[PDB]
Amino acid sequence: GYSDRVRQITLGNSTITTQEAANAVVAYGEWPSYLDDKEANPIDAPTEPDVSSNRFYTLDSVQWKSTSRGWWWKLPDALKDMGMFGQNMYYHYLGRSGYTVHVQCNASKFHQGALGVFAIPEYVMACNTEAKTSYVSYVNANPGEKGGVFDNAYNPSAEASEGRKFAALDYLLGCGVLAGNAFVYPHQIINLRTNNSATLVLPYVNSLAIDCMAKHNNWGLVILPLCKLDYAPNSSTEIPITVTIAPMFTEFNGLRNITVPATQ
Amino acid sequence: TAQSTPLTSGVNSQEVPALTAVETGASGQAVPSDVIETRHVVNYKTRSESTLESFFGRSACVTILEVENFNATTDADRKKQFTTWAITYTDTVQLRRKLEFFTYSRFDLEMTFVITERYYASNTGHARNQVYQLMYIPPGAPRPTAWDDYTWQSSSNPSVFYTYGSAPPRMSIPYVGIANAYSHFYDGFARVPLKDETVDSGDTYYGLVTINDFGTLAVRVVNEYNPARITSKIRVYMKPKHVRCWCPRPPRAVPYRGEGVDFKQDSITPLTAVENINTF
Amino acid sequence: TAQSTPLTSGVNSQEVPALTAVETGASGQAVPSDVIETRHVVNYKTRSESTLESFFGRSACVTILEVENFNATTDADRKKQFTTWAITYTDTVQLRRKLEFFTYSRFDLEMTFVITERYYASNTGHARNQVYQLMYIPPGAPRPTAWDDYTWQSSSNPSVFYTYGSAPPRMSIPYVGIANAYSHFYDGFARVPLKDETVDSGDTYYGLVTINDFGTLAVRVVNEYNPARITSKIRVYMKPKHVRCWCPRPPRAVPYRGEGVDFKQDSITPLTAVENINTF
Amino acid sequence: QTSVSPSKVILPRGGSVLVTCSTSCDQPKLLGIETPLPKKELLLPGNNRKVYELSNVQEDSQPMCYSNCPDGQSTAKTFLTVYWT
Amino acid sequence: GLPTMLTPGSSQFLTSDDFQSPCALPNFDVTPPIHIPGEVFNMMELAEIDSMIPMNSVTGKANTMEMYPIPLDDKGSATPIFSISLSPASDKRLQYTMLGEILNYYTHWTGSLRFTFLFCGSMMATGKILLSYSPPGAKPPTTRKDAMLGTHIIWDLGLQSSCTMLAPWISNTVYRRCIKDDFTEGGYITCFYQTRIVVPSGTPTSMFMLAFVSACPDFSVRLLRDTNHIS
């Protein structure tokens, strides 16, 4: 009676239904959970925002053209201004969170294309200057909601001003590894003849037990167009990719006044 | 062992293992007994060398250190008398690439110091046999200013004294990370630049290099100045043992240009273009 | 032990063991108790030294390698700074001849490196004590171009660092053959030249030498250039242990002229002609 | 890695061209010249150096000389022209 | 105190030894471990993951994101869609895959390979594609009546949108080498339009296809060495 293509996911007061889905990837075979008492790093009383922040948040819909080359989001910081998870984050020094990334892109049965949806632990990217090394600013490394785009050309700016940003090169995947090897990460491929949604379940992955979300970006969401979009009547059409992310099993420590980072 | 191969024959049925769907995220799963007819092959071949304890079971080279020993007169000649090296695994490109397969690792480190000498000039006399100090300076202990100051006496810093001509000195350093694993890649800063700071930390370095302080290996020549200038070379080695690793990553393809994950413009082309797609 | 000798006496009967027929392929089978009268000799003599573990139980010499150490200016002087040797047992004529008794063999190999030095010139100063790198390069790892390139750092290649003046370095290499035994003699090519090729592989080498890649032993001097030119000689040794062998063959009679089974024209006459057939 | 000494050859139509192709190695596992032109061999001592004797050169040809050194497959060509009245 | 004798191989530093050593930090209370997800216990856990082959690495499309999609159309030619040797450590289009990078740390490998092919055309584009594996030692297959005689698989297009051509372990040696060697050559692989791919009106004619590579569960390596990508 049941099928693998119809899936409803509910967290808090938010619901995603999908009728042409592929199967869901639990990353590295572990469902996210709270910090156990045998591994706890801080000793303060942890805040568990039970349903106020364990819910789906819908980002901005980027448009996937025929010349679109890729997108990237840093995952505990693309939700920095989303409801109460953006208010649980900056009022606390520590924070761990599991995730349910759901990437939404659909077309007709006459379109074609592929979207490698990745989820990269410690997605450290390269700077866009050759004056200095490991050299990216804070605003350019943490865009938040809008994310960033990749590029099919590496043009390092000789200015140290405009070179403090990610040299988001698509075939080297930012960090100088080939993109055809990126399938060792937890990944799904949106193929516009088979499916229309990619669902990943991401546990908290870090060397520490719990860490500052304001400093440290745990996961990296990556969407690569493997085969470009090609619609035969209108070759320059645009189908939107909408990313909907939920925090899961969040836990925070060290309450204080609000942290407001710089914007420039 | 690895898996054997069962004696199977041909099929004609609705059970189709040759067709998968990699949109679901899982890889291929067909073993060769599925799609063809196979014999029975008892497989005694094991994967014993490919494990992480033997994949990292080599004493790699991480740096080359140079000290000298002569009658120093100027100030640049007094800075050739010792050498302080910040301990890292990124000063070469081969043990680094074997470790950037993995995001997080946990290993007790074993070092060995292979040390050579030479005469600099030809007719400036001779020299006696030499003893070399190698002092592990944790972050906070005073780094040496001159080659014979109060810092080299090492009342609490771990020092080894290698007499030249002996077997190379060896020691094991435990897991000294303050995390529960060494973050090979760290996607974050050291601090948070706040709103309306007069500090203006618009030069905070990205990523990994703002969290790693593993120490300083300061090396002097314990002798005083000989009449003949003795130039030495020291090759610090590392061998990760008791190795555990987590969260695998693709390996480094294009060359490095620093301590980060950066890549230089003139070597962004690792492949060589084939003649056409149909070239065996 | 070997066989004893039974107390037998003379016979007169139809049982005739003295007459065999070597057309059938079997050798002779008469022991001396058959054809004569023998006493009783209890034989305590054993064949313990003639077994294959003791017949190959010597550290033979397989090659002689030369490296130097001086201030290299030209390009030929930079190729004296290191030496890369393709590993084989055929560069001498005595361990080879003991192994070409047998068609196929299976043995863990144990090597030891006995190394000498000398001064080249007389009045060009002196030199410090020296450390020698010996790096085992499997087929595929990059062979060194210069003596101090990226290849010598050996993040995964097995290297040994011999300080000159110590006991000679020793190591055991396992059975690394991709067959189930080392084919001493291989009667076949590496490929099949097809009909109407435009490739024209009419220079494919015969036989053995197109299948053996055992590695490359690259040796440098880890020191920089001393004022005095130090010329070294290195004698790579092999000692087959845990030896098994199959399918015996006649031993080599005439001398060699290469890595194959070839033989030179001026030494096709191994015998010395006797005076006549009746010469004791 | 692979050297062809007669790189620039001028010779009329129909004649013979001596092509010398060797490698920079000591063990040429697989070495040969790729052309559909008739050639027997030329005698040359040495396990490395090598000469093929090409003949009946009619059109402009560019033969490829591979050599299977233990560092990949190598490539060297030669350039030859013809003459007509 | 005790009569000892020094054997050969004393006072050497072997870079692949296994000895004990004095700990320079005695009594270092190490940081207690936590359960980090995704623990790797063996490098052959990474050989069994698919990874795209740069199959379309022709002049102009190499070194960019067009290296991966293989060109297809509706013309139904007799020419091969792609053709590649079976040398997953020394071929110019396989050594940069995730399987190819691990094999360039080793020297000898055995086992069978797994080629999973994703069709990224439209929904209405139906077709059949031949996928073939020929063991070496004959003519390299160019026409369809040469690759049908090997180990092949006829794949159909539709709902289940990923085939799997398996290249079995058919070899004289127990262990092929990780170089371009003549004696341990792997095999010849082609790909033919079985019938052709048919598109209706209002549907693109020129399409693409993605090609993966992984390792079967009888795949194993030996003899660690350095690599030849980095310097």
PDB file of N, CA and C in Angstrom, chain C residues 43-113:
ATOM      1  N   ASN C  43      73.317 -45.961   9.558  1.00  0.00           N
ATOM      2  CA  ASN C  43      73.643 -44.687   8.936  1.00  0.00           C
ATOM      3  C   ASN C  43      73.037 -43.569   9.775  1.00  0.00           C
ATOM      4  N   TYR C  44      73.890 -42.803  10.448  1.00  0.00           N
ATOM      5  CA  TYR C  44      73.451 -41.671  11.249  1.00  0.00           C
ATOM      6  C   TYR C  44      73.607 -40.342  10.527  1.00  0.00           C
ATOM      7  N   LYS C  45      74.081 -40.353   9.287  1.00  0.00           N
ATOM      8  CA  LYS C  45      74.316 -39.129   8.538  1.00  0.00           C
ATOM      9  C   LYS C  45      73.007 -38.597   7.976  1.00  0.00           C
ATOM     10  N   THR C  46      72.718 -37.328   8.233  1.00  0.00           N
ATOM     11  CA  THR C  46      71.484 -36.719   7.767  1.00  0.00           C
ATOM     12  C   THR C  46      71.760 -35.743   6.635  1.00  0.00           C
ATOM     13  N   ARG C  47      70.683 -35.364   5.955  1.00  0.00           N
ATOM     14  CA  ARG C  47      70.720 -34.446   4.822  1.00  0.00           C
ATOM     15  C   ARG C  47      70.259 -33.057   5.225  1.00  0.00           C
ATOM     16  N   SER C  48      70.635 -32.609   6.423  1.00  0.00           N
ATOM     17  CA  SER C  48      70.027 -31.415   6.993  1.00  0.00           C
ATOM     18  C   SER C  48      70.528 -30.137   6.338  1.00  0.00           C
ATOM     19  N   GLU C  49      71.756 -30.129   5.824  1.00  0.00           N
ATOM     20  CA  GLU C  49      72.275 -28.903   5.238  1.00  0.00           C
ATOM     21  C   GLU C  49      71.835 -28.733   3.795  1.00  0.00           C
ATOM     22  N   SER C  50      71.505 -29.825   3.119  1.00  0.00           N
ATOM     23  CA  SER C  50      71.124 -29.772   1.720  1.00  0.00           C
ATOM     24  C   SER C  50      69.700 -29.289   1.489  1.00  0.00           C
ATOM     25  N   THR C  51      68.908 -29.059   2.534  1.00  0.00           N
ATOM     26  CA  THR C  51      67.544 -28.595   2.330  1.00  0.00           C
ATOM     27  C   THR C  51      67.530 -27.151   1.845  1.00  0.00           C
ATOM     28  N   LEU C  52      66.398 -26.758   1.255  1.00  0.00           N
ATOM     29  CA  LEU C  52      66.291 -25.466   0.586  1.00  0.00           C
ATOM     30  C   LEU C  52      66.357 -24.290   1.543  1.00  0.00           C
ATOM     31  N   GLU C  53      65.993 -24.483   2.807  1.00  0.00           N
ATOM     32  CA  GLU C  53      66.109 -23.390   3.760  1.00  0.00           C
ATOM     33  C   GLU C  53      67.567 -23.111   4.097  1.00  0.00           C
ATOM     34  N   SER C  54      68.426 -24.128   4.028  1.00  0.00           N
ATOM     35  CA  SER C  54      69.853 -23.937   4.232  1.00  0.00           C
ATOM     36  C   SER C  54      70.643 -23.860   2.936  1.00  0.00           C
ATOM     37  N   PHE C  55      70.073 -24.295   1.815  1.00  0.00           N
ATOM     38  CA  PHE C  55      70.755 -24.113   0.539  1.00  0.00           C
ATOM     39  C   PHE C  55      70.700 -22.663   0.090  1.00  0.00           C
ATOM     40  N   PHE C  56      69.645 -21.943   0.460  1.00  0.00           N
ATOM     41  CA  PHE C  56      69.547 -20.514   0.210  1.00  0.00           C
ATOM     42  C   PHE C  56      69.804 -19.687   1.456  1.00  0.00           C
ATOM     43  N   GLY C  57      70.319 -20.293   2.517  1.00  0.00           N
ATOM     44  CA  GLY C  57      70.475 -19.593   3.774  1.00  0.00           C
ATOM     45  C   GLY C  57      71.758 -18.801   3.894  1.00  0.00           C
ATOM     46  N   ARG C  58      72.079 -18.022   2.869  1.00  0.00           N
ATOM     47  CA  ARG C  58      73.237 -17.146   2.875  1.00  0.00           C
ATOM     48  C   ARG C  58      72.804 -15.785   2.359  1.00  0.00           C
ATOM     49  N   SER C  59      73.399 -14.727   2.895  1.00  0.00           N
ATOM     50  CA  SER C  59      73.131 -13.381   2.397  1.00  0.00           C
ATOM     51  C   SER C  59      74.038 -13.121   1.204  1.00  0.00           C
ATOM     52  N   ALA C  60      73.528 -13.365   0.005  1.00  0.00           N
ATOM     53  CA  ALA C  60      74.311 -13.194  -1.206  1.00  0.00           C
ATOM     54  C   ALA C  60      74.396 -11.720  -1.579  1.00  0.00           C
ATOM     55  N   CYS C  61      75.212 -11.420  -2.583  1.00  0.00           N
ATOM     56  CA  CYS C  61      75.331 -10.071  -3.115  1.00  0.00           C
ATOM     57  C   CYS C  61      74.618  -9.994  -4.454  1.00  0.00           C
ATOM     58  N   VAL C  62      73.839  -8.933  -4.657  1.00  0.00           N
ATOM     59  CA  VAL C  62      73.068  -8.836  -5.890  1.00  0.00           C
ATOM     60  C   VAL C  62      73.485  -7.633  -6.727  1.00  0.00           C
ATOM     61  N   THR C  63      74.028  -6.588  -6.099  1.00  0.00           N
ATOM     62  CA  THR C  63      74.483  -5.415  -6.838  1.00  0.00           C
ATOM     63  C   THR C  63      75.443  -4.610  -5.977  1.00  0.00           C
ATOM     64  N   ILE C  64      76.059  -3.611  -6.605  1.00  0.00           N
ATOM     65  CA  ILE C  64      76.932  -2.644  -5.948  1.00  0.00           C
ATOM     66  C   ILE C  64      76.493  -1.258  -6.394  1.00  0.00           C
ATOM     67  N   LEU C  65      76.073  -0.426  -5.447  1.00  0.00           N
ATOM     68  CA  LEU C  65      75.572   0.907  -5.751  1.00  0.00           C
ATOM     69  C   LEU C  65      76.543   1.973  -5.274  1.00  0.00           C
ATOM     70  N   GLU C  66      76.696   3.023  -6.075  1.00  0.00           N
ATOM     71  CA  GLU C  66      77.624   4.107  -5.789  1.00  0.00           C
ATOM     72  C   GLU C  66      76.883   5.429  -5.711  1.00  0.00           C
ATOM     73  N   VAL C  67      77.052   6.134  -4.594  1.00  0.00           N
ATOM     74  CA  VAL C  67      76.605   7.510  -4.446  1.00  0.00           C
ATOM     75  C   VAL C  67      77.797   8.340  -3.993  1.00  0.00           C
ATOM     76  N   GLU C  68      77.708   9.649  -4.216  1.00  0.00           N
ATOM     77  CA  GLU C  68      78.738  10.577  -3.772  1.00  0.00           C
ATOM     78  C   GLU C  68      78.095  11.744  -3.039  1.00  0.00           C
ATOM     79  N   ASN C  69      78.936  12.687  -2.608  1.00  0.00           N
ATOM     80  CA  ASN C  69      78.471  13.826  -1.821  1.00  0.00           C
ATOM     81  C   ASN C  69      79.488  14.951  -2.005  1.00  0.00           C
ATOM     82  N   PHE C  70      79.154  15.924  -2.847  1.00  0.00           N
ATOM     83  CA  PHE C  70      80.027  17.072  -3.054  1.00  0.00           C
ATOM     84  C   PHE C  70      79.214  18.228  -3.607  1.00  0.00           C
ATOM     85  N   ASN C  71      79.885  19.365  -3.758  1.00  0.00           N
ATOM     86  CA  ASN C  71      79.270  20.577  -4.288  1.00  0.00           C
ATOM     87  C   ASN C  71      79.081  20.397  -5.789  1.00  0.00           C
ATOM     88  N   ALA C  72      77.876  20.019  -6.195  1.00  0.00           N
ATOM     89  CA  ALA C  72      77.610  19.738  -7.596  1.00  0.00           C
ATOM     90  C   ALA C  72      77.365  21.034  -8.354  1.00  0.00           C
ATOM     91  N   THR C  73      78.052  21.195  -9.483  1.00  0.00           N
ATOM     92  CA  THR C  73      77.889  22.365 -10.335  1.00  0.00           C
ATOM     93  C   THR C  73      77.211  22.014 -11.652  1.00  0.00           C
ATOM     94  N   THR C  74      77.762  21.066 -12.404  1.00  0.00           N
ATOM     95  CA  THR C  74      77.174  20.669 -13.671  1.00  0.00           C
ATOM     96  C   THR C  74      76.001  19.726 -13.434  1.00  0.00           C
ATOM     97  N   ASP C  75      75.434  19.208 -14.519  1.00  0.00           N
ATOM     98  CA  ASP C  75      74.300  18.305 -14.399  1.00  0.00           C
ATOM     99  C   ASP C  75      74.716  16.863 -14.163  1.00  0.00           C
ATOM    100  N   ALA C  76      75.856  16.442 -14.712  1.00  0.00           N
ATOM    101  CA  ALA C  76      76.343  15.098 -14.435  1.00  0.00           C
ATOM    102  C   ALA C  76      76.788  14.962 -12.988  1.00  0.00           C
ATOM    103  N   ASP C  77      77.221  16.061 -12.375  1.00  0.00           N
ATOM    104  CA  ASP C  77      77.559  16.046 -10.958  1.00  0.00           C
ATOM    105  C   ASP C  77      76.326  15.981 -10.070  1.00  0.00           C
ATOM    106  N   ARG C  78      75.165  16.402 -10.567  1.00  0.00           N
ATOM    107  CA  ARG C  78      73.944  16.271  -9.786  1.00  0.00           C
ATOM    108  C   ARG C  78      73.334  14.884  -9.890  1.00  0.00           C
ATOM    109  N   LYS C  79      73.731  14.092 -10.880  1.00  0.00           N
ATOM    110  CA  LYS C  79      73.277  12.715 -10.961  1.00  0.00           C
ATOM    111  C   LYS C  79      74.212  11.746 -10.258  1.00  0.00           C
ATOM    112  N   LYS C  80      75.350  12.221  -9.760  1.00  0.00           N
ATOM    113  CA  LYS C  80      76.164  11.429  -8.853  1.00  0.00           C
ATOM    114  C   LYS C  80      75.695  11.549  -7.413  1.00  0.00           C
ATOM    115  N   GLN C  81      74.791  12.485  -7.129  1.00  0.00           N
ATOM    116  CA  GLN C  81      74.314  12.717  -5.774  1.00  0.00           C
ATOM    117  C   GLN C  81      73.348  11.646  -5.294  1.00  0.00           C
ATOM    118  N   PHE C  82      72.757  10.877  -6.201  1.00  0.00           N
ATOM    119  CA  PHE C  82      71.861   9.799  -5.816  1.00  0.00           C
ATOM    120  C   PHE C  82      72.005   8.669  -6.822  1.00  0.00           C
ATOM    121  N   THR C  83      71.372   7.540  -6.515  1.00  0.00           N
ATOM    122  CA  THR C  83      71.382   6.396  -7.419  1.00  0.00           C
ATOM    123  C   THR C  83      70.085   5.629  -7.242  1.00  0.00           C
ATOM    124  N   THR C  84      69.369   5.407  -8.337  1.00  0.00           N
ATOM    125  CA  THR C  84      68.147   4.617  -8.336  1.00  0.00           C
ATOM    126  C   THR C  84      68.439   3.282  -8.999  1.00  0.00           C
ATOM    127  N   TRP C  85      68.185   2.196  -8.283  1.00  0.00           N
ATOM    128  CA  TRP C  85      68.445   0.850  -8.771  1.00  0.00           C
ATOM    129  C   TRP C  85      67.141   0.086  -8.890  1.00  0.00           C
ATOM    130  N   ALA C  86      66.883  -0.456 -10.075  1.00  0.00           N
ATOM    131  CA  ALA C  86      65.754  -1.356 -10.245  1.00  0.00           C
ATOM    132  C   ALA C  86      66.053  -2.670  -9.542  1.00  0.00           C
ATOM    133  N   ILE C  87      65.149  -3.094  -8.667  1.00  0.00           N
ATOM    134  CA  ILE C  87      65.388  -4.266  -7.833  1.00  0.00           C
ATOM    135  C   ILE C  87      65.247  -5.526  -8.673  1.00  0.00           C
ATOM    136  N   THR C  88      66.315  -6.317  -8.724  1.00  0.00           N
ATOM    137  CA  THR C  88      66.306  -7.622  -9.365  1.00  0.00           C
ATOM    138  C   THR C  88      67.432  -8.451  -8.771  1.00  0.00           C
ATOM    139  N   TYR C  89      67.354  -9.761  -8.985  1.00  0.00           N
ATOM    140  CA  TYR C  89      68.373 -10.685  -8.516  1.00  0.00           C
ATOM    141  C   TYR C  89      69.329 -11.101  -9.622  1.00  0.00           C
ATOM    142  N   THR C  90      69.233 -10.482 -10.796  1.00  0.00           N
ATOM    143  CA  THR C  90      69.966 -10.924 -11.971  1.00  0.00           C
ATOM    144  C   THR C  90      71.208 -10.098 -12.261  1.00  0.00           C
ATOM    145  N   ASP C  91      71.537  -9.125 -11.420  1.00  0.00           N
ATOM    146  CA  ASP C  91      72.702  -8.291 -11.677  1.00  0.00           C
ATOM    147  C   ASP C  91      74.005  -8.925 -11.214  1.00  0.00           C
ATOM    148  N   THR C  92      73.955 -10.091 -10.582  1.00  0.00           N
ATOM    149  CA  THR C  92      75.117 -10.943 -10.379  1.00  0.00           C
ATOM    150  C   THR C  92      74.828 -12.313 -10.975  1.00  0.00           C
ATOM    151  N   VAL C  93      75.802 -13.213 -10.860  1.00  0.00           N
ATOM    152  CA  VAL C  93      75.742 -14.510 -11.518  1.00  0.00           C
ATOM    153  C   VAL C  93      75.834 -15.671 -10.548  1.00  0.00           C
ATOM    154  N   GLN C  94      75.746 -15.433  -9.245  1.00  0.00           N
ATOM    155  CA  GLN C  94      75.831 -16.530  -8.289  1.00  0.00           C
ATOM    156  C   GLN C  94      74.554 -16.777  -7.504  1.00  0.00           C
ATOM    157  N   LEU C  95      73.839 -15.738  -7.070  1.00  0.00           N
ATOM    158  CA  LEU C  95      72.516 -15.984  -6.505  1.00  0.00           C
ATOM    159  C   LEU C  95      71.511 -16.293  -7.602  1.00  0.00           C
ATOM    160  N   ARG C  96      71.757 -15.786  -8.810  1.00  0.00           N
ATOM    161  CA  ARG C  96      70.911 -16.106  -9.953  1.00  0.00           C
ATOM    162  C   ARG C  96      70.991 -17.581 -10.306  1.00  0.00           C
ATOM    163  N   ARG C  97      72.202 -18.137 -10.314  1.00  0.00           N
ATOM    164  CA  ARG C  97      72.393 -19.520 -10.725  1.00  0.00           C
ATOM    165  C   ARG C  97      71.835 -20.486  -9.694  1.00  0.00           C
ATOM    166  N   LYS C  98      71.853 -20.102  -8.420  1.00  0.00           N
ATOM    167  CA  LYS C  98      71.230 -20.917  -7.387  1.00  0.00           C
ATOM    168  C   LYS C  98      69.713 -20.862  -7.451  1.00  0.00           C
ATOM    169  N   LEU C  99      69.143 -19.803  -8.026  1.00  0.00           N
ATOM    170  CA  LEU C  99      67.697 -19.695  -8.174  1.00  0.00           C
ATOM    171  C   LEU C  99      67.180 -20.228  -9.499  1.00  0.00           C
ATOM    172  N   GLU C 100      68.020 -20.334 -10.524  1.00  0.00           N
ATOM    173  CA  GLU C 100      67.591 -20.930 -11.779  1.00  0.00           C
ATOM    174  C   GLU C 100      67.764 -22.441 -11.802  1.00  0.00           C
ATOM    175  N   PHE C 101      67.974 -23.064 -10.642  1.00  0.00           N
ATOM    176  CA  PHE C 101      67.643 -24.475 -10.506  1.00  0.00           C
ATOM    177  C   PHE C 101      66.148 -24.710 -10.606  1.00  0.00           C
ATOM    178  N   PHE C 102      65.335 -23.734 -10.213  1.00  0.00           N
ATOM    179  CA  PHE C 102      63.915 -23.957 -10.005  1.00  0.00           C
ATOM    180  C   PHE C 102      63.101 -23.012 -10.867  1.00  0.00           C
ATOM    181  N   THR C 103      61.973 -23.508 -11.362  1.00  0.00           N
ATOM    182  CA  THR C 103      61.125 -22.688 -12.211  1.00  0.00           C
ATOM    183  C   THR C 103      60.361 -21.659 -11.394  1.00  0.00           C
ATOM    184  N   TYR C 104      59.719 -22.090 -10.315  1.00  0.00           N
ATOM    185  CA  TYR C 104      58.891 -21.209  -9.511  1.00  0.00           C
ATOM    186  C   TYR C 104      59.343 -21.280  -8.064  1.00  0.00           C
ATOM    187  N   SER C 105      59.325 -20.145  -7.373  1.00  0.00           N
ATOM    188  CA  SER C 105      59.746 -20.106  -5.981  1.00  0.00           C
ATOM    189  C   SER C 105      58.881 -19.134  -5.194  1.00  0.00           C
ATOM    190  N   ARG C 106      58.914 -19.290  -3.874  1.00  0.00           N
ATOM    191  CA  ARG C 106      58.077 -18.508  -2.967  1.00  0.00           C
ATOM    192  C   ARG C 106      58.871 -18.299  -1.687  1.00  0.00           C
ATOM    193  N   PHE C 107      59.283 -17.065  -1.418  1.00  0.00           N
ATOM    194  CA  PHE C 107      60.193 -16.826  -0.308  1.00  0.00           C
ATOM    195  C   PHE C 107      60.067 -15.398   0.196  1.00  0.00           C
ATOM    196  N   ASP C 108      60.137 -15.243   1.515  1.00  0.00           N
ATOM    197  CA  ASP C 108      60.241 -13.926   2.123  1.00  0.00           C
ATOM    198  C   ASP C 108      61.695 -13.490   2.096  1.00  0.00           C
ATOM    199  N   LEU C 109      61.939 -12.276   1.630  1.00  0.00           N
ATOM    200  CA  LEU C 109      63.284 -11.838   1.300  1.00  0.00           C
ATOM    201  C   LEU C 109      63.820 -10.950   2.413  1.00  0.00           C
ATOM    202  N   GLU C 110      65.083 -11.149   2.779  1.00  0.00           N
ATOM    203  CA  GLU C 110      65.708 -10.425   3.879  1.00  0.00           C
ATOM    204  C   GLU C 110      66.972  -9.754   3.373  1.00  0.00           C
ATOM    205  N   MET C 111      67.021  -8.431   3.470  1.00  0.00           N
ATOM    206  CA  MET C 111      68.091  -7.641   2.883  1.00  0.00           C
ATOM    207  C   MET C 111      68.941  -6.990   3.964  1.00  0.00           C
ATOM    208  N   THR C 112      70.215  -6.763   3.643  1.00  0.00           N
ATOM    209  CA  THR C 112      71.126  -6.090   4.558  1.00  0.00           C
ATOM    210  C   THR C 112      72.127  -5.291   3.736  1.00  0.00           C
ATOM    211  N   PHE C 113      72.457  -4.093   4.197  1.00  0.00           N
ATOM    212  CA  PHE C 113      73.118  -3.083   3.378  1.00  0.00           C
ATOM    213  C   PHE C 113      74.474  -2.742   3.972  1.00  0.00           C
TER     214      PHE C 113
END
